[PDB]
Design a protein around this motif. Structure first.
Motif, PDB file in Angstrom:
ATOM      1  N   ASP A  39      29.928 -11.086  13.963  1.00 35.02           N
ATOM      2  CA  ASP A  39      29.374 -10.310  15.072  1.00 35.02           C
ATOM      3  C   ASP A  39      29.307  -8.823  14.736  1.00 35.02           C
ATOM      4  O   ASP A  39      29.590  -7.971  15.577  1.00 35.02           O
ATOM      5  CB  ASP A  39      30.188 -10.527  16.351  1.00 35.02           C
ATOM      6  N   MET A 221      34.903  -8.947  21.784  1.00 36.56           N
ATOM      7  CA  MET A 221      34.000 -10.085  21.648  1.00 36.56           C
ATOM      8  C   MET A 221      32.543  -9.654  21.787  1.00 36.56           C
ATOM      9  O   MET A 221      31.638 -10.490  21.788  1.00 36.56           O
ATOM     10  CB  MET A 221      34.334 -11.163  22.681  1.00 36.56           C
ATOM     11  N   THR A 222      32.328  -8.348  21.911  1.00 39.24           N
ATOM     12  CA  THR A 222      30.992  -7.788  22.087  1.00 39.24           C
ATOM     13  C   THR A 222      30.073  -8.137  20.913  1.00 39.24           C
ATOM     14  O   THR A 222      30.499  -8.136  19.757  1.00 39.24           O
ATOM     15  CB  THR A 222      31.048  -6.256  22.250  1.00 39.24           C
ATOM     16  N   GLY A 223      28.814  -8.437  21.221  1.00 38.91           N
ATOM     17  CA  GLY A 223      27.847  -8.853  20.220  1.00 38.91           C
ATOM     18  C   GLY A 223      27.003  -7.718  19.670  1.00 38.91           C
ATOM     19  O   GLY A 223      27.468  -6.586  19.556  1.00 38.91           O
ATOM     20  N   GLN A 224      25.756  -8.029  19.324  1.00 42.68           N
ATOM     21  CA  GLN A 224      24.838  -7.053  18.740  1.00 42.68           C
ATOM     22  C   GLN A 224      24.484  -5.915  19.699  1.00 42.68           C
ATOM     23  O   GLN A 224      23.938  -4.894  19.281  1.00 42.68           O
ATOM     24  CB  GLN A 224      23.555  -7.747  18.274  1.00 42.68           C
ATOM     25  N   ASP A 225      24.791  -6.095  20.980  1.00 41.99           N
ATOM     26  CA  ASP A 225      24.545  -5.059  21.978  1.00 41.99           C
ATOM     27  C   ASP A 225      25.501  -3.883  21.788  1.00 41.99           C
ATOM     28  O   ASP A 225      25.259  -2.780  22.291  1.00 41.99           O
ATOM     29  CB  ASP A 225      24.682  -5.632  23.391  1.00 41.99           C
ATOM     30  N   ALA A 251      38.386 -13.961  18.634  1.00 42.88           N
ATOM     31  CA  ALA A 251      37.118 -13.311  18.321  1.00 42.88           C
ATOM     32  C   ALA A 251      37.148 -12.619  16.962  1.00 42.88           C
ATOM     33  O   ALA A 251      38.196 -12.162  16.505  1.00 42.88           O
ATOM     34  CB  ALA A 251      36.758 -12.312  19.410  1.00 42.88           C
TER      35      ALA A 251
END
Ligand SMILES: Nc1nc2c(ncn2[C@@H]2O[C@H](COP(=O)(O)OP(=O)(O)O)[C@@H](O)[C@H]2O)c(=O)[nH]1
Ligand SMILES: Nc1nc2c(ncn2[C@@H]2O[C@H](COP(=O)(O)OP(=O)(O)O)[C@@H](O)[C@H]2O)c(=O)[nH]1
Ligand code: ALF
Ligand code: ALF
Ligand SMILES: [Mg+2]
Ligand SMILES: [Mg+2]
Lengths: 450, 271
Positions: A39, A221-225, A251
């Protein structure tokens, strides 16, 4: 998986050469996919890959055992170097009160972070802390912060949803300056980068209180954002640091690398749990160490590497200590080789010009003298040998009492050793032929023996 | 044409879809485009929407709360995904067609969660059953179901505490909650809701994995779609776990809950 993939890649593509750019292709691709599953922001992945290339061009890999292992070492070193340094802390030096502003998205855990930092600064740093809730939006958020503050034993500044964030943080700052608070913690509402009013709000707040510390709280856990959020928040506010939360999860946590790269701001804190008493400092090596799972492969390798390390260390140290110069160790060797090979009768014959001037019977017996010297040296510790200049009177007493002789003899042998050291130093500095021909027979006048 | 491959790949990667699902979709799209011989881009977009539409075809099943007295919806998920807000929305959403709604606070851990759900309950003008911070959740939910059966409540929404999937004890606690809920009604809970944040990465796969291996999730709610996060991991969890998607939160307001639609999700995805 990383080590296996890299080792397999470097083995199957090329044999043993010195690694070149052509061999790092599939490596860079597998690392790319590994970071994509981690991620990590794609631009950050690419910009890291470039550095990996720059390090791949000059590989010293050929001389080692496992190429994948040392490549992993290089990647880890670069990643740790990218994560920043350790012991990163908020600046509580500051002219009190110290104002800490919170920023992030919804459900980022900013409030819990305020509680954690509250307890942490109160207990450990012995600071007087005042907390305030700038959130008029989220239901029972103020009551939540008040509850946490009541649990951590930190004073809370009353606020309601009928007020405005600006007036709230202004009254909080005023109360902090009036009551001489050491640290002012400001909790704010979670907001989206696509929201203009909220960004203008946090900008007006940041401009109002002028915080010495602006923290960015983002989920692990934040993604491509995370790229967009980090960029927007960095451009909106001069962040003094980044606070990562929910690290205790399974994560991957590549968002940390993302934000760290894009914003350029260091991570000063890692939430290890939900509770207020649970907080951990950010260690670049720990975060950059683990995204993986494996077993039994790394142990043997780390063992072998340790063996090679300690071996190379001891072997280099042994040559370094002996390479400092002439000492009582080499003097001892030359003395035992002397007493074994002692040529006094033969050396009297070997010498010609010195025998014509000096007396013929003036040659001392080798056996007694060199046995005395050997035995007296045997009374010396290894430290007094390699480092002869630390020898003093008490040590001379120990030596003389040990060998059962007089201290003047010890001083005599130290004098002879000084002469030998000087001589051998002159042999090392110049030529043996210039130095052998520079040897002179001292005569205080042309009269013999006078 | 490789530039198109790279472009599409990047577009799929920035959407948090995952590399496996990306590989599958790109492969099927390649076979399909090679088969249909599409020389235009619009047909490629259309075919893509058809494939991903087939991926979302199984999960499009709407939620039916009718037929049960009460209809128990268990809201589960990780921390800060806005389960409570989703409940606050579902209250009015279920209040609109004339179904009576009661709320239950299942989080005794987090501070002011009870008070929050009481605020959301006050906004909807509906009774809310809760005790205190630190209380047993299963007991509160149980009493809530019993009361709902006595009060003839049509729909009962049961909140839960924010919990990470890697924690086994909390999973056993949730299993205890379900087991206790099995006493009054065998088919309870009728609906198990997994609330996933849109900003969540590939970790959502593991979340949904363990939560399905535990509670047997019957549904998934994707919130916080008003940001730039499209939440493309939902395609992966829908591929593997085949779990339906009930609704999508478009904001923090009570009117921001919308029924999940595949076409609208597709429209918002590429835009
Ligand atoms: N495991 C874990 N959970 C966290 C952490 N920080 C926050 N949380 C969770 O986040 C939930 C509430 O988030 P909150 O602070 O209200 O969001 P915010 O006020 O918008 O920043 C709590 O129930 C916590 O369990 C953390 O560092 N670790
Ligand atoms: N913009 C937006 N915000 C949301 C959404 N869902 C939840 N939130 C925000 O998330 C915040 C805290 O979430 P919370 O309900 O406490 O998390 P949980 O109770 O652990 O599930 C609330 O203040 C909401 O404003 C959404 O769909 N969109
Ligand atoms: F849930 Al918040 F600020 F507490 F967005
Ligand atoms: F913030 Al929660 F369950 F309400 F983690
Ligand atoms: Mg808050
Ligand atoms: Mg909640």
């Amino acid at each position: 998986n990383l080590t296996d993939r890299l080792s397999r890649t470097l083995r199957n593509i090329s044999g043993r050469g010195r690694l070149t750019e052509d061999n790092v292709k599939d490596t860079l691709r597998e690392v790319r996919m590994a970071l994509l599953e981690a991620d990590v922001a794609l631009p950050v992945v690419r910009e890291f890959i470039n550095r990996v290339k720059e390090k791949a061009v000059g590989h010293e890999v050929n001389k080692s055992l496992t190429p994948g292992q040392e490549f992993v070492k290089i990647v880890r070193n670069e990643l740790v170097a990218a994560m920043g340094e350790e012991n990163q802390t908020l600046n509580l030096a500051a002219q009190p009160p110290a104002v800490v502003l919170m920023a992030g998205l919804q459900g980022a855990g900013k409030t819990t972070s305020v509680g954690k930092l509250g307890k942490f600064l109160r207990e450990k740093h012995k600071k007087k802390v005042l907390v305030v809730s700038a959130d008029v939006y989220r239901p029972a958020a103020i009551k939540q912060l008040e509850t946490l503050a009541e649990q951590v034993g930190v004073d809370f500044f009353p606020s309601d949803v009928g007020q405005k964030p600006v007036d709230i943080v202004n009254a909080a700052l005023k109360e902090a300056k009036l009551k001489f608070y050491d640290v002012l913690l400001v909790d704010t509402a979670g907001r989206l980068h696509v929201d203009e009013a909220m960004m203008d709000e946090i900008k007006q707040v940041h401009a109002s209180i002028n915080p010495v510390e602006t923290l960015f709280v983002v989920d692990a856990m934040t993604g491509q954002d995370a790229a967009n959020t980090a960029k927007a928040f960095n451009e909106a506010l001069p962040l003094t640091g980044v606070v990562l939360t929910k690290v205790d999860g399974d994560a991957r946590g590549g968002a940390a690398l993302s934000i760290r790269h894009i914003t350029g701001k260091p991570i000063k804190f890692l939430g290890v749990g939900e509770k207020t008493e649970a907080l951990e400092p950010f260690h670049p090596d720990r975060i950059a160490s683990r995204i993986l799972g494996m077993g039994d492969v790394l142990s043997l390798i780390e063992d072998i590497e340790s063996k090679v390390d300690r071996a190379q260390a001891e072997k280099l140290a042994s040559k370094l200590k002996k390479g400092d110069g002439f000492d009582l160790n080499d003097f001892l060797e030359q003395l035992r080789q002397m007493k074994n090979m002692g040529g006094x009768x033969x050396x009297x014959x070997x010498x010609x010009x010195x025998x014509x001037x000096x007396x013929x019977x003036x040659x001392x017996x080798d056996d007694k003298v060199l046995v005395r010297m050997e035995a007296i040296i045997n009374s010396m510790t290894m430290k007094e040998r390699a480092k002869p200049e630390i020898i003093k009177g008490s040590r001379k007493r120990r030596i003389a009492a040990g060998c059962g002789m007089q201290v003047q003899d010890v001083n005599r042998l130290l004098k002879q050793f000084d002469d030998m050291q000087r001589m051998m130093k002159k042999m090392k500095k110049g030529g043996x032929x210039x130095x052998x021909x520079x040897x002179x027979x001292x005569x205080x006048x042309x009269x013999x023996x006078x | 044409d490789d530039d198109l491959f790279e472009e599409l790949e990047e577009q799929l990667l920035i959407a948090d879809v995952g590399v496996e699902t990306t590989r599958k979709i790109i492969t099927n799209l390649t076979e399909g485009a090679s088969r249909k011989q599409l020389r235009d881009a619009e047909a490629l977009y259309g075919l893509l929407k058809e494939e991903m539409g087939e991926i979302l075809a199984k999960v499009d099943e709407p939620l039916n709360v009718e037929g049960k007295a009460p209809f128990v919806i268990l809201m589960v998920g990780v921390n800060g995904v806005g389960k409570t807000t989703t409940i606050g929305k579902l209250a009015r959403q279920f209040e609109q067609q004339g179904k009576s709604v009661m709320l239950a606070a299942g989080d005794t851990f987090r501070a002011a969660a009870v008070e929050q759900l009481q605020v959301w309950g006050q906004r909807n003008n509906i009774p809310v059953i809760a005790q205190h911070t630190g209380a047993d959740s299963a007991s509160v939910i149980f009493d809530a179901i019993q009361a709902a059966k006595a009060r003839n409540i049509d729909v009962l929404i049961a909140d839960t505490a924010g919990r990470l999937q890697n924690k086994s004890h909390l999973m056993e606690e949730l299993k205890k909650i379900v087991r206790v809920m099995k006493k009054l009604d065998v088919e309870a809970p009728h609906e198990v809701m997994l609330t996933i944040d849109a900003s969540t990465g590939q970790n959502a796969v593991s979340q949904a994995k363990l939560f399905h291996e535990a509670v047997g999730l019957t549904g998934i709610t994707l919130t916080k779609l008003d940001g730039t996060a499209k939440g493309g991991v939902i395609f992966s969890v829908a591929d593997q776990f085949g779990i339906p998607i009930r609704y999508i939160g478009v904001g923090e307001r009570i009117e921001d809950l919308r029924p999940f639609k595949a076409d609208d999700f597709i429209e918002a995805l590429f835009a």
